[PDB]
Coordinates of C-alpha atoms in Angstrom, one line a residue:
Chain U
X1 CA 76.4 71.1 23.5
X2 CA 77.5 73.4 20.7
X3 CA 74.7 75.7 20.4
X4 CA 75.1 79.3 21.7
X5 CA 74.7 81.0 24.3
X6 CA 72.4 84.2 25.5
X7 CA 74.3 86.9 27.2
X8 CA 73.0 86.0 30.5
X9 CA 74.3 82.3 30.9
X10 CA 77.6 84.1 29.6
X11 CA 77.1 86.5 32.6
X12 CA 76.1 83.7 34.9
X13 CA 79.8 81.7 33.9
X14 CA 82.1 84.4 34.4
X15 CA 80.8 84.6 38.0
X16 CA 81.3 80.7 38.5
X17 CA 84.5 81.5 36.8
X18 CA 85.3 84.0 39.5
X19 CA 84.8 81.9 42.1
X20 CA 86.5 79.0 40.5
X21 CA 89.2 81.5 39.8
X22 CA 89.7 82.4 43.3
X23 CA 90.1 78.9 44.4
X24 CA 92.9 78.4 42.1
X25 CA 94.2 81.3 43.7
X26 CA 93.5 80.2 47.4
X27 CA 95.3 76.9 46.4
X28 CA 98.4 78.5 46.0
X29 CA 99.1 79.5 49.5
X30 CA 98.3 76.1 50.6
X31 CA 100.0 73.4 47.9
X32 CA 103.3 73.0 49.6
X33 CA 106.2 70.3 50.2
X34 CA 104.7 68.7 54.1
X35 CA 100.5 69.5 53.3
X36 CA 98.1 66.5 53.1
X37 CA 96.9 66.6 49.5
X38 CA 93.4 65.7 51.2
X39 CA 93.6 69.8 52.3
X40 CA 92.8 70.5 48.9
X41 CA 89.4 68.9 49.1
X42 CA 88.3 70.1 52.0
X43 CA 89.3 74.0 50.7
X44 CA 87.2 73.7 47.8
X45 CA 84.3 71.6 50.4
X46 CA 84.4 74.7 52.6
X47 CA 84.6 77.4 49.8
X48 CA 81.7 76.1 48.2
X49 CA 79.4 75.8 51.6
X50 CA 80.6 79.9 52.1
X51 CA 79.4 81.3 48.7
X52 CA 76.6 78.7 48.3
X53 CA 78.3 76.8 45.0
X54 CA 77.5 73.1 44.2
X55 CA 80.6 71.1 43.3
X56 CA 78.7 69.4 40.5
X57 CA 81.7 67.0 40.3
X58 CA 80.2 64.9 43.3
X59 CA 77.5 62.2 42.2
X60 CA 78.8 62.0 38.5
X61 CA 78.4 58.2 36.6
X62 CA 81.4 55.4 36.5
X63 CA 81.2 52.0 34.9
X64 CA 82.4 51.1 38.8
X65 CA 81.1 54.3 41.0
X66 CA 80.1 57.6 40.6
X67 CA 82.6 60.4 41.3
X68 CA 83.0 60.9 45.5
X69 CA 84.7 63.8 44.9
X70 CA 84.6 67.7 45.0
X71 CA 87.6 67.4 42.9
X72 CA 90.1 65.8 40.7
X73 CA 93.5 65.6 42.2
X74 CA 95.8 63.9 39.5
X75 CA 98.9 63.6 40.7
X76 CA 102.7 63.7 38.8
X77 CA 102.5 60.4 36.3
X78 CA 98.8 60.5 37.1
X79 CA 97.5 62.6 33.9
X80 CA 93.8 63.4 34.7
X81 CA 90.6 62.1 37.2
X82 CA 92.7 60.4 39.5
X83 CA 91.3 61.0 43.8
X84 CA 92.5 63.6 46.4
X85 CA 93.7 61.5 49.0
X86 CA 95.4 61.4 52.7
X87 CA 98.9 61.5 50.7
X88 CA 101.5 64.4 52.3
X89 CA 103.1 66.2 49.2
X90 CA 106.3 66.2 48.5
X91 CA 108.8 68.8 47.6
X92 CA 108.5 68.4 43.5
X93 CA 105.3 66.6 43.0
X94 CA 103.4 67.9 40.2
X95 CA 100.1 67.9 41.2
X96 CA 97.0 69.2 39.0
X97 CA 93.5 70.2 40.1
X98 CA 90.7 70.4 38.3
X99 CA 87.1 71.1 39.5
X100 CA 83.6 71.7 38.9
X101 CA 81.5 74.2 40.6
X102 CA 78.1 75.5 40.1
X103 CA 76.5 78.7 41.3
X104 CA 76.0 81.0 43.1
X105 CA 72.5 80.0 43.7
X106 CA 69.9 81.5 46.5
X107 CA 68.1 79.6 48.5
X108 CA 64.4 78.8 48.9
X109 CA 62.1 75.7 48.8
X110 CA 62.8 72.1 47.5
X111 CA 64.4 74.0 44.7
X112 CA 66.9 76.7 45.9
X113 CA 69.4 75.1 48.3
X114 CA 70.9 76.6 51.6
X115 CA 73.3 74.0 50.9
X116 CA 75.4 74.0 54.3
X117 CA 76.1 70.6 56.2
X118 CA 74.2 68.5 53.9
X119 CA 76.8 65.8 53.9
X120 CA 79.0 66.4 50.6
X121 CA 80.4 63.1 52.0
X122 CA 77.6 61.3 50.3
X123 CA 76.1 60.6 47.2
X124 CA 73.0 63.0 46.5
X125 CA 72.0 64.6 43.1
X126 CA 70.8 67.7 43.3
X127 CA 74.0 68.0 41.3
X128 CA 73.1 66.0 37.8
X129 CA 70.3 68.1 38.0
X130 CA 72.0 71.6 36.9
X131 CA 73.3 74.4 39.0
X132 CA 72.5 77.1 35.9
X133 CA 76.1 78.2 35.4
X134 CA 79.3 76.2 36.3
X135 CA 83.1 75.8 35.0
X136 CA 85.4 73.3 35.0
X137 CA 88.9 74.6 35.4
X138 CA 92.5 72.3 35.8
X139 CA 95.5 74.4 36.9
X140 CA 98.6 72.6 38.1
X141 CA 100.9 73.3 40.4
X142 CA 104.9 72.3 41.5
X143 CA 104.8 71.8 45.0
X144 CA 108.3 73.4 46.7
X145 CA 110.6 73.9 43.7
X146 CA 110.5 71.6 40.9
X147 CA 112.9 69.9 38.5
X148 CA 113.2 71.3 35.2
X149 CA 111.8 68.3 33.9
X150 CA 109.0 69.8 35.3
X151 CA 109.5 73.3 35.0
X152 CA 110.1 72.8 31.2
X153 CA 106.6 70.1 31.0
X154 CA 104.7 72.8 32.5
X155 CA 105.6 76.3 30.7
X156 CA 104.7 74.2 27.1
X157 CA 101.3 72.8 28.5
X158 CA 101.0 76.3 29.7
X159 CA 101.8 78.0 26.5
X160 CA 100.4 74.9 24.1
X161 CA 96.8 76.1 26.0
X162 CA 97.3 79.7 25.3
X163 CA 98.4 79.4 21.8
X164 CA 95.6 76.8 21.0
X165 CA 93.5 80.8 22.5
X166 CA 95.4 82.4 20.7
X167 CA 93.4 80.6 17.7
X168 CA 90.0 81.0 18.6
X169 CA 89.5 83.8 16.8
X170 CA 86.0 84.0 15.0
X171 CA 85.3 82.7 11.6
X172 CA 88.4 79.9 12.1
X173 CA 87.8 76.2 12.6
X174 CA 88.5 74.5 16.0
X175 CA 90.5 72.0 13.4
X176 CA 92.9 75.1 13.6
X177 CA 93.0 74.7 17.5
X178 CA 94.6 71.5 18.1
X179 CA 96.4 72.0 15.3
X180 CA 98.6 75.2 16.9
X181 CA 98.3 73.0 20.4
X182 CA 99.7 69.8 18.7
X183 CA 102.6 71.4 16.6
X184 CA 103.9 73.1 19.7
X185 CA 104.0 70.4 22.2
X186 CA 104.7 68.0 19.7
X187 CA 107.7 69.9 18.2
X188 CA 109.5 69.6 21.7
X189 CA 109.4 65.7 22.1
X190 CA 106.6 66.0 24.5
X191 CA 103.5 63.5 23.4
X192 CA 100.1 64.9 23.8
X193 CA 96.9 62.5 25.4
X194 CA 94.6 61.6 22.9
X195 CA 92.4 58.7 24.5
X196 CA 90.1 61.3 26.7
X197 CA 89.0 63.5 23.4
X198 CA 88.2 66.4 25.3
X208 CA 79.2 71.2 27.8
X209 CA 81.5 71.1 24.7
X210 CA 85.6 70.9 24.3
X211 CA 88.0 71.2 22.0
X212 CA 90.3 68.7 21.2
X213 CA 94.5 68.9 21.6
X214 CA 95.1 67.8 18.6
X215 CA 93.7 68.0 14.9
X216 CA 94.5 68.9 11.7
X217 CA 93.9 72.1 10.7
X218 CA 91.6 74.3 9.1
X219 CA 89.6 70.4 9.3
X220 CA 86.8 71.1 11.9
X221 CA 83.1 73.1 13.4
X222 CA 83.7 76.9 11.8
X223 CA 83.5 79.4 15.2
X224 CA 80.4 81.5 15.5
X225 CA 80.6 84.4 18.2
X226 CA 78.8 83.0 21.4
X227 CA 80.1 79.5 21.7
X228 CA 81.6 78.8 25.2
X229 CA 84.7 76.5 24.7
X230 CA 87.0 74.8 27.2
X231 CA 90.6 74.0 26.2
X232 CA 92.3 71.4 28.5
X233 CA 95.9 70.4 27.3
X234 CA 97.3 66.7 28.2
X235 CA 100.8 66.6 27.9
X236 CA 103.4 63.9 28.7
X237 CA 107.1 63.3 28.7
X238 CA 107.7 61.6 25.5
X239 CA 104.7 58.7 25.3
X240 CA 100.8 59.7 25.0
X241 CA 99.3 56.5 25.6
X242 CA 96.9 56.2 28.8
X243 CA 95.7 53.4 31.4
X244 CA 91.7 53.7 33.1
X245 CA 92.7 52.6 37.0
X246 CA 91.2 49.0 36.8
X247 CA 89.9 49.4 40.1
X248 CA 87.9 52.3 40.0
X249 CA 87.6 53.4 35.9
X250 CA 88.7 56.6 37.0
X251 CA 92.2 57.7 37.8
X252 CA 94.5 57.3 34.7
X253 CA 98.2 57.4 34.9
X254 CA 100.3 57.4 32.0
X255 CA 101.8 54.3 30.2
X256 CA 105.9 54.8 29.9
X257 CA 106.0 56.1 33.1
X258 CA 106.1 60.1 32.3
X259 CA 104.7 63.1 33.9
X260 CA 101.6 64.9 32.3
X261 CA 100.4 67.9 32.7
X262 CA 97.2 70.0 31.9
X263 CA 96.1 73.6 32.2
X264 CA 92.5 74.9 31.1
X265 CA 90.3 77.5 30.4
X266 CA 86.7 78.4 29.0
X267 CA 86.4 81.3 26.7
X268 CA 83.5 82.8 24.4
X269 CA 84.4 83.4 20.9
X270 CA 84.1 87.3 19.8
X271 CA 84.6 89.4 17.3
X272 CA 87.8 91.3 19.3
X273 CA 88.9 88.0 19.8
X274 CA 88.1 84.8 22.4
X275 CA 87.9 86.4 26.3
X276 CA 87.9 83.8 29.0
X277 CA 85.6 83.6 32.1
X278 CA 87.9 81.3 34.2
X279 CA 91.0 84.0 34.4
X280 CA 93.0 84.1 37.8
X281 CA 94.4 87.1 36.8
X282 CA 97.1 87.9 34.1
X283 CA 97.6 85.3 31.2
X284 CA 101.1 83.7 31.0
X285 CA 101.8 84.8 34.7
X286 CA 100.3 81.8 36.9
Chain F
X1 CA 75.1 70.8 16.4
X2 CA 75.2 68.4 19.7
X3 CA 71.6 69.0 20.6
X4 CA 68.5 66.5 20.1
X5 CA 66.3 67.0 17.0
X6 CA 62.4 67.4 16.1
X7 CA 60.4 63.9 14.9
X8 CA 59.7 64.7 11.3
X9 CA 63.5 66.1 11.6
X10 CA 64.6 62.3 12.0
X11 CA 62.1 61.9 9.2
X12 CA 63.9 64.2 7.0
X13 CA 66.9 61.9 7.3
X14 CA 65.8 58.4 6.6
X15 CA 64.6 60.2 3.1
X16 CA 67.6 61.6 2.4
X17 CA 69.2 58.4 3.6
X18 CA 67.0 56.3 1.9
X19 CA 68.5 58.0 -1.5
X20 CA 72.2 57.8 -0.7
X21 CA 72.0 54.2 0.1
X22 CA 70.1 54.3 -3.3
X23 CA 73.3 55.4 -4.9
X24 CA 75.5 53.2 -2.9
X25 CA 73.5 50.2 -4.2
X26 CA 74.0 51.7 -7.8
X27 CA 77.4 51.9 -7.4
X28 CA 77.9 48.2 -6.4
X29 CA 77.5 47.6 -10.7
X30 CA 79.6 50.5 -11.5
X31 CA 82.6 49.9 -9.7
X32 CA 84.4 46.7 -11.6
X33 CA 87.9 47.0 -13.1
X34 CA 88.8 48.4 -16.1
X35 CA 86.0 51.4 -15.5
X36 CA 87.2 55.4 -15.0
X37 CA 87.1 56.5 -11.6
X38 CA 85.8 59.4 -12.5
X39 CA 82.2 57.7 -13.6
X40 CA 81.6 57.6 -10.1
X41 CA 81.1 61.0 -9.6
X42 CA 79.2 62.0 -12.5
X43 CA 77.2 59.2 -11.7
X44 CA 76.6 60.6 -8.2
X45 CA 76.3 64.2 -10.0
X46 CA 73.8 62.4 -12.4
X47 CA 71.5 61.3 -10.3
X48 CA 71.2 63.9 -7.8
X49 CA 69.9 65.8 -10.8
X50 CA 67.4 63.4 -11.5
X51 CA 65.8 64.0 -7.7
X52 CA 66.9 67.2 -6.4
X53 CA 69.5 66.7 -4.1
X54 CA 72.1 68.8 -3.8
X55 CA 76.0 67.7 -3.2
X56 CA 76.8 69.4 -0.3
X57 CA 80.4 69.0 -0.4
X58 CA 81.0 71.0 -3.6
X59 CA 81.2 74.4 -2.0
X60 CA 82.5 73.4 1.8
X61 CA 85.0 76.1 2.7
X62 CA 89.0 74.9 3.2
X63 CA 92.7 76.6 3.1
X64 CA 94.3 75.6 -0.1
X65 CA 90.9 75.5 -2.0
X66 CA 87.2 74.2 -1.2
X67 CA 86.2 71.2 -1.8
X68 CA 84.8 70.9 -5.6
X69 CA 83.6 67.5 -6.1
X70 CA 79.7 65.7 -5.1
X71 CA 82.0 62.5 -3.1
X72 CA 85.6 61.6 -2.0
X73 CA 86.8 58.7 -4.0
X74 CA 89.7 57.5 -1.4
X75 CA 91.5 54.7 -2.9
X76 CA 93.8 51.8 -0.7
X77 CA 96.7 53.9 1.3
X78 CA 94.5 56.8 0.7
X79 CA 92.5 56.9 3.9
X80 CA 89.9 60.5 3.9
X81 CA 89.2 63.0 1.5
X82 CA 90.5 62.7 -1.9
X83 CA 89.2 63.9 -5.2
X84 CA 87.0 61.8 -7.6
X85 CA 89.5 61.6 -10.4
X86 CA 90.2 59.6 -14.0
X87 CA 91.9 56.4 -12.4
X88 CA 91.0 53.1 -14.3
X89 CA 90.5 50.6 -11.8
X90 CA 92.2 47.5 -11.2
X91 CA 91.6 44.6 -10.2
X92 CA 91.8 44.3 -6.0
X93 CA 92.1 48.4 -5.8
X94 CA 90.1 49.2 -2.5
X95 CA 87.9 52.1 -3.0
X96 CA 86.0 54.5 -0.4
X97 CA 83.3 56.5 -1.4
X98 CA 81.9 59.2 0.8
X99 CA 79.6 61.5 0.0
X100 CA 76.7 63.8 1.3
X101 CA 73.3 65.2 -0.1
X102 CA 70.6 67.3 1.0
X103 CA 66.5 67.4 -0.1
X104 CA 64.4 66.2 -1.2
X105 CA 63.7 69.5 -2.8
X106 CA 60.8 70.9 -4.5
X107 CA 61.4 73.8 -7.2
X108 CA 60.9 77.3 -8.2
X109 CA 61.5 81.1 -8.1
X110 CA 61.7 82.3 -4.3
X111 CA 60.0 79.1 -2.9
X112 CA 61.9 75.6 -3.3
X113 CA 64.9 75.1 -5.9
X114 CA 65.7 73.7 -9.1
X115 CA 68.9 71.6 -9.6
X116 CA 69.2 70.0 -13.6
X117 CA 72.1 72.7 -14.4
X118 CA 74.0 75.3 -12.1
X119 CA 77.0 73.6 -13.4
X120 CA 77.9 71.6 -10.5
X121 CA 81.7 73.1 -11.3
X122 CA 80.9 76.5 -10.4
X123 CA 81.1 78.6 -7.4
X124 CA 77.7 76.7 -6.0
X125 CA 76.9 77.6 -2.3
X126 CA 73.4 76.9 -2.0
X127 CA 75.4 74.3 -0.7
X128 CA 76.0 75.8 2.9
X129 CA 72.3 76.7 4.2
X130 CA 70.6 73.8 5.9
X131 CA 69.3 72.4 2.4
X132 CA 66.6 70.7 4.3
X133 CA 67.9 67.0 6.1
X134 CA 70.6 65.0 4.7
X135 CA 73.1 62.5 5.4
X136 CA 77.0 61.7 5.2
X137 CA 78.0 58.1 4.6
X138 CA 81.0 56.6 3.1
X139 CA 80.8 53.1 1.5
X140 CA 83.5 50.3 0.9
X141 CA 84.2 48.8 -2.4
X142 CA 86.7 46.1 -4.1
X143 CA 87.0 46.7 -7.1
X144 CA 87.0 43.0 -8.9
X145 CA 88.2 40.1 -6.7
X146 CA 90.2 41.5 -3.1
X147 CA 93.4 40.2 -1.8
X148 CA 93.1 38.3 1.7
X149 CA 94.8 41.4 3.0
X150 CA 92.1 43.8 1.7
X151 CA 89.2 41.4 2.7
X152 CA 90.3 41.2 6.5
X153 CA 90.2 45.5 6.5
X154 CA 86.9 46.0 5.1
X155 CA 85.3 43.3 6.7
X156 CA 87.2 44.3 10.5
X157 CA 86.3 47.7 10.0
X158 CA 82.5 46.9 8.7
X159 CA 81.8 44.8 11.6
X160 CA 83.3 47.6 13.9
X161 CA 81.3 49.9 13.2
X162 CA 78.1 47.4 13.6
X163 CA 79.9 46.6 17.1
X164 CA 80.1 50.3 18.2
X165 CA 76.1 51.0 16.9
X166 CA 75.7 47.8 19.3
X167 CA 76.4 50.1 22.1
X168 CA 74.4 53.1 21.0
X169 CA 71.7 52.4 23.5
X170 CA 69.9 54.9 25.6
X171 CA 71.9 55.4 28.8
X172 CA 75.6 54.4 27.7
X173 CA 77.8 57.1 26.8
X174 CA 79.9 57.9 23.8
X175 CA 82.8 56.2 25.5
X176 CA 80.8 52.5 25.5
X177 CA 80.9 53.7 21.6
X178 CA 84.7 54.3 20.7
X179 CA 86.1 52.0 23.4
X180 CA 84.4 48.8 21.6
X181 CA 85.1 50.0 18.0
X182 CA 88.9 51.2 19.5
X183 CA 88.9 47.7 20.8
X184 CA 87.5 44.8 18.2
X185 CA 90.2 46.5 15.0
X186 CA 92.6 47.0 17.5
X187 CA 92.7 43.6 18.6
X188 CA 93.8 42.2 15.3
X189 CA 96.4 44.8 15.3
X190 CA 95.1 47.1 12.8
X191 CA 95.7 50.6 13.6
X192 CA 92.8 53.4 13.9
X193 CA 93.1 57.1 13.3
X194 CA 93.2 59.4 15.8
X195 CA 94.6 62.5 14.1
X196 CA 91.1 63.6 12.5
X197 CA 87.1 63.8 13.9
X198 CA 86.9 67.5 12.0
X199 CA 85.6 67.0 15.9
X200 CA 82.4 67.0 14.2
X201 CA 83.8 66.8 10.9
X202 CA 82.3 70.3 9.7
X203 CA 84.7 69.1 7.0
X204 CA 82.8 67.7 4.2
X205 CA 79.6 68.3 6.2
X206 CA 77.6 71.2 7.9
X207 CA 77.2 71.0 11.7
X208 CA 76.3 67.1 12.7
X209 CA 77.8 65.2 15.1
X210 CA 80.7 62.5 15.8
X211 CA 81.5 59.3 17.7
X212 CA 85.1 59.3 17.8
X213 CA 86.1 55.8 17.2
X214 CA 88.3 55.6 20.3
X215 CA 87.9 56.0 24.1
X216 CA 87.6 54.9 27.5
X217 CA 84.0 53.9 28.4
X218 CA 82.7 56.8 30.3
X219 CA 84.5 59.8 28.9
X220 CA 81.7 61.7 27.4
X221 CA 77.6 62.4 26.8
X222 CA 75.6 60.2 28.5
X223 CA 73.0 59.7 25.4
X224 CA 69.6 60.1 25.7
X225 CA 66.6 59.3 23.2
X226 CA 66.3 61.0 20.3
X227 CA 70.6 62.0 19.2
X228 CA 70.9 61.2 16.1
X229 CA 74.5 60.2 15.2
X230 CA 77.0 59.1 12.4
X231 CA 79.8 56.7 12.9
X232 CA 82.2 55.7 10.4
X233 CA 85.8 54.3 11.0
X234 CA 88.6 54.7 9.5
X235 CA 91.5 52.0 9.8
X236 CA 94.7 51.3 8.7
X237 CA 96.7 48.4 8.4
X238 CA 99.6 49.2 10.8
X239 CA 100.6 53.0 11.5
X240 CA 97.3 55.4 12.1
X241 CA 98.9 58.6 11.4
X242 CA 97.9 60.3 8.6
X243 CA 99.3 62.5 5.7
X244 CA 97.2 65.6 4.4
X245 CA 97.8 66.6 1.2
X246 CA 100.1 69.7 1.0
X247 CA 98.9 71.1 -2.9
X248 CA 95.2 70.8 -2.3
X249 CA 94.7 70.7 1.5
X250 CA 92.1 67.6 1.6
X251 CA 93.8 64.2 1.0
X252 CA 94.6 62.0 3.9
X253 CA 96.7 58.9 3.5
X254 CA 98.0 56.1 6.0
X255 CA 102.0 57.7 6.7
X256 CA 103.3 54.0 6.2
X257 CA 101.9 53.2 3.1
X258 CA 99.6 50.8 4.9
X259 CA 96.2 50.4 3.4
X260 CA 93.3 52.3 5.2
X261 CA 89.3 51.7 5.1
X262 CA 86.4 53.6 6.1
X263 CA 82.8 52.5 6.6
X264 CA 79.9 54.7 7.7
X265 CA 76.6 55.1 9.2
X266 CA 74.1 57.4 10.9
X267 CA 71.3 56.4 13.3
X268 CA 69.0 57.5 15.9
X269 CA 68.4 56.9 19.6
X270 CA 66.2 55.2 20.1
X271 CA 64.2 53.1 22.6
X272 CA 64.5 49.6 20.9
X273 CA 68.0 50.5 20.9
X274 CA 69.3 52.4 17.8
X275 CA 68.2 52.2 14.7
X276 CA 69.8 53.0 11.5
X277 CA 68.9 56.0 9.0
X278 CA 71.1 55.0 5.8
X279 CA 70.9 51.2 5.5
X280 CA 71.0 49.5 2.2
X281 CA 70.3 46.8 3.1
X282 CA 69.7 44.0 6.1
X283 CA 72.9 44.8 8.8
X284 CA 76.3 42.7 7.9
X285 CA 75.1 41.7 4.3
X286 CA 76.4 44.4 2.0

């Protein structure tokens, strides 16, 4: 939804943006070559029963199923909404997480949940119905050391993300977004997703000064597929959720959320300083 | 905005669709071979004199220069966004006519405008204030008797678009929308752009929203009764990428010199299924 936002439900996102933050920053003590992927889950399943946030992932619709879990866990070729699973990593997987989370809510009657050992492992909305404030936030990770295959994918989807930021500036068009976004990846041989067209998000790719002027306000999310050469994108047939790239390559994806201000665009979902994570 | 709307606000729109479709119908006489190109738009300019409705695209901010004219007169490997200009027609030229207009409008002093004269060449931004309800639609035209070639893209991508509405029920999402209309052109090996959606073509427009006309069939809002939504394909024979003019900033044209087509609608949610706020006509006939 494009319309502003009051102060307040800014307020209330930087705080899910804290917490989300802090995962992110949990995770990296823990993704390592020898760890069961599933670890990941259960990190951001025990975080969230701690400081009372809903993982508003869990109970969302699919032509097949609704999402089971807390978390996306999309894996090297694997480009986005694919399953954490019972998999040991491997020293130089790529492995991206995104989440999620809603909160921090009180608790109270049959409105403001306590929220601990209500089994996450099943298939109950009080999620669809809103947790107030929330963020989704993908950050990847190399697991041990990577190859600079890797190393390379990730610094551009990195800096593609932060350049598409460094854009947001008010009175500009988001046209002038995915066009910075495309022109950098793009101009390297790596092949952006298109087939996902990323609460509202910007898309990766665009031409520019060609879309919705920026008003001060707006909450955005900027979330940066990237592949090895070929963009093109399969839906698991199975499931109609994890999607792996077509030629084979790796992808990659980093993302924020911002508000747009005069000053410049100021992000909620920071773990810190930008450029070095 | 990607919100829901009021229930005279859909109103607002079927009137102000009612009188582009109007035009469109006009247009179907004007545009034979041999006639200027530029008729169209003065045509367009003409009558939205005649009822005040102002074109909303004269005025719409850009780089290189804003865009100056009432409708985009794309013609055959031209795809989005080009000038109304003095072309003479000929015979199987494939012509797309976009355009949008806001009102009706009553006149006056500091209550309700006039429109016979502010010289619609002029630095006119009235233009860029919610001028009431409106609506964007492009139309498709062959100009005297269409190749085979020609006749397969306008009639691939008019059915299309009928096939995406299709799934604009209450309770799909977007995805159901883009997949199927991805889908049926793509099937015959046509291509369909990617590389512009304004996303929420604030190009040529104030605000409203998009179905992209590609997806997967969950990724995005669930829709719910009362969305009211425009749809409008563009495809391309072959490649889908897309040039943009580098003097004036606006034109868009197929990379391969493929032809490229573009038909549009808008329509509401709602509970019968969707139902259609510009039609000129009965669905499939025109």
């Amino acid at each position: 939804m494009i319309t502003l936002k009051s102060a307040r439900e800014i307020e209330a996102m930087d705080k899910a943006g804290d917490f989300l933050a802090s995962i992110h920053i949990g995770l990296r003590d823990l993704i390592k070559p020898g760890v069961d992927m599933w670890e990941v889950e259960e990190y951001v399943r025990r975080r969230c029963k701690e400081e009372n946030f809903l993982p508003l992932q869990i109970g969302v619709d699919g032509a097949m199923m609704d999402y089971p879990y807390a978390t996306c866990c999309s894996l090297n070729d694997e480009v986005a909404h694919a399953f954490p699973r019972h998999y040991i990593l491997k020293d130089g997987d790529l492995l991206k997480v995104d989440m999620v989370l809603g909160g921090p809510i009180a608790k109270s009657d049959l409105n403001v949940s306590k929220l601990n050992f209500n089994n996450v492992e099943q298939m109950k909305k009080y999620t669809q119905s809103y947790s107030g404030g929330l963020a989704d936030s993908c950050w990847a990770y190399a697991v041990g050391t990577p190859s600079e295959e890797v190393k390379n994918l990730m610094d551009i989807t990195k800096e593609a993300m932060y350049k598409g930021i460094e854009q947001a500036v008010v009175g500009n068009r988001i046209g002038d977004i995915g066009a910075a976004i495309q022109e950098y990846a793009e101009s390297r041989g790596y092949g952006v997703v298109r087939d996902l067209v990323g609460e509202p998000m910007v898309p990766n790719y665009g031409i520019a000064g060609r879309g919705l002027r920026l008003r001060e306000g707006m909450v955005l999310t900027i979330e940066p597929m990237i592949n090895t050469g070929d963009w093109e994108i399969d839906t698991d047939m199975k499931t109609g959720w994890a999607h792996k790239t077509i030629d084979g390559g790796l992808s990659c994806q980093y993302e924020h959320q911002f508000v747009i201000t005069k000053d410049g665009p100021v992000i909620l979902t920071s773990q810190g300083e930008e450029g070095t994570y």
